[PDB]
Design a protein around this ligand. Structure first.
Ligand SMILES: Cc1cc2nc3c(=O)[nH]c(=O)nc-3n(C[C@H](O)[C@H](O)[C@H](O)COP(=O)(O)OP(=O)(O)OC[C@H]3O[C@@H](n4cnc5c(N)ncnc54)[C@H](O)[C@@H]3O)c2cc1C
Length: 309
């Protein structure tokens, strides 16, 4: 049974909030918790950050928060750092089910000399390390929310949603899936098919795996979940197993769902897309279809949702 969430007045707004806080006057939020999401064999750290916004910075699932890390802009003396955007990984109610917190899924950007491996603090990512280094009680300059590309289409509560993530691109889908399956939201009762595909480097790099696996047991007729591990698995051609390769294992089912009106979403680092497009083109060709024409139709019908970075 679904978890009680409050306050239900978060369902009343008819439009998503946008730019509630702007960079010149951010909202000063407070860190609740920071935890690593990954095990010792992961190539780098990805963290889950819970942020208390006090109900002052509400959002809809699929939106992003901006964070302004501390310090001066190196390219602009006397001026703050540029905003960095992070897909919100929580529902509008947040991980405490109270409408006061939101969560981020943050990959630490670390520099290594391509020959020696030697680090250099001046070359680390500023905001990602700032966030993953944070501790309860620390203050965060929050902006936004922003973005509409990844809003969840709720007009059809029995729609099909095919969610394609790599790494931190899982973030919006954690929010979608909690709203679909975990939370007691009386005005959104999902009875369609949600299908999550997740590509990461290895088993230790999985993100929220226990949560997603539990949906298989709770909603076996409404949720599917497939994973790819690039460094621990190979595709049928004997390249590294990427999220495009798991899609190909379900070629027929996927194309049938798209033809029936399914939404398909892509999120994560933009390098994921070339290989996905290559696979989809080849799958279409094997079926005797033109991927160009299919993609044009999916775009025209508003079924195709991409937020990569
Ligand atoms: C819509 C959207 C959603 C996003 N969602 C997420 C998300 O959920 N999770 C997430 O982790 N990220 C996400 N991102 C990316 C995020 O916004 C940041 O770009 C990212 O976290 C890195 O920012 P940073 O401040 O750490 O790096 P920056 O300080 O901006 O540095 C960028 C890169 O340059 C490198 N670098 C800096 N100086 C040098 C140098 N001299 N030589 C070589 N390399 C150098 C850094 O190591 C880093 O790898 C999203 C982006 C967008 C647009």
């Amino acid at each position: 049974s679904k978890v009680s969430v409050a306050p239900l007045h978060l369902e009343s707004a008819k439009e998503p909030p946008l730019n509630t806080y702007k960079p010149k006057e951010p909202f000063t939020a407070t860190i609740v918790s920071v935890e690593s999401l990954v095990g010792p064999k992961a190539p780098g750290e990805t963290c889950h950050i819970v942020i208390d916004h006090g109900g002052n910075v509400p959002y809809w699932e699929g939106q992003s928060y901006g964070v302004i890390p501390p310090g001066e802009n190196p390219k602009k003396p006397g001026a703050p750092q540029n905003v960095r955007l992070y897909s919100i990984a929580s529902t509008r109610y947040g991980d405490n089910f109270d409408g006061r917190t939101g969560s981020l899924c943050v990959r630490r950007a670390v520099y290594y000399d391509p020959e020696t491996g030697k680090e250099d603090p001046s070359k680390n990512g500023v905001c990602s390390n700032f966030l993953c280094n944070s501790k309860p009680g620390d203050k965060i300059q929050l902006t936004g929310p922003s973005g509409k590309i990844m809003l969840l289409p709720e007009e059809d509560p029995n729609a099909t949603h095919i969610m394609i993530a790599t790494g931190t691109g899982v973030a919006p889908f954690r929010g979608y899936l909690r709203r679909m399956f975990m939370e007691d939201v009386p005005n959104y009762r999902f009875g369609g098919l949600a299908w999550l595909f997740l590509g990461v480097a290895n088993s230790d790099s999985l993100l929220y795996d226990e949560e997603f696996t539990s949906y298989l047991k709770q909603y076996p007729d409404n949720f599917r979940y497939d994973k790819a591990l690039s460094r621990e698995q190979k595709n049928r051609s004997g390249g590294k197993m990427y999220v495009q390769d798991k899609i190909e294992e379900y070629s027929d089912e996927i194309f049938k769902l798209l033809d029936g009106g399914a939404h398909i979403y892509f999120c994560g680092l933009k390098g994921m897309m070339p290989g996905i497009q290559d696979t989809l083109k080849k799958v279409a060709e094997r079926r005797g279809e033109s991927w160009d024409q299919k993609l044009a139709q999916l775009k025209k019908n508003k079924q195709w949702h991409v937020e990569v970075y």
